[PDB]
Amino acid sequence: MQIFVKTLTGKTITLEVEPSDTIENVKAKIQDKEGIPPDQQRLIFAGKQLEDGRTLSDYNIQKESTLHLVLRLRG
Question: Does residue 2 interact with its own copies by CB under 8 A?
Answer: yes
Question: Does residue 58 interact with Zn ion by CB under 5 A?
Answer: no
Of its own copies, Zn ion, none, which one does residue 73 interact with (CB within 5 to 8 Å by kind)?
its own copies
Helix/strand/coil for 31: helix
| Polymer length of the chain | 75
- Please identify, using beta-carbon distances, which residue of 71 and 73 lies nearer to its own copies: 73
In whole angstroms, how close is the CB of 62 to its own copies at the nearest point? Answer: 9
Question: Does residue 38 interact with Zn ion by CB under 5 A?
Answer: yes
Question: Does residue 75 interact with its own copies by CB under 8 A?
Answer: yes
| Residues 48, 31: Cα–Cα separation, whole Å | 21
Contact present, 65 and 14 (Cβ < 8 Å): no
One-letter amino acid identity for 31? Q
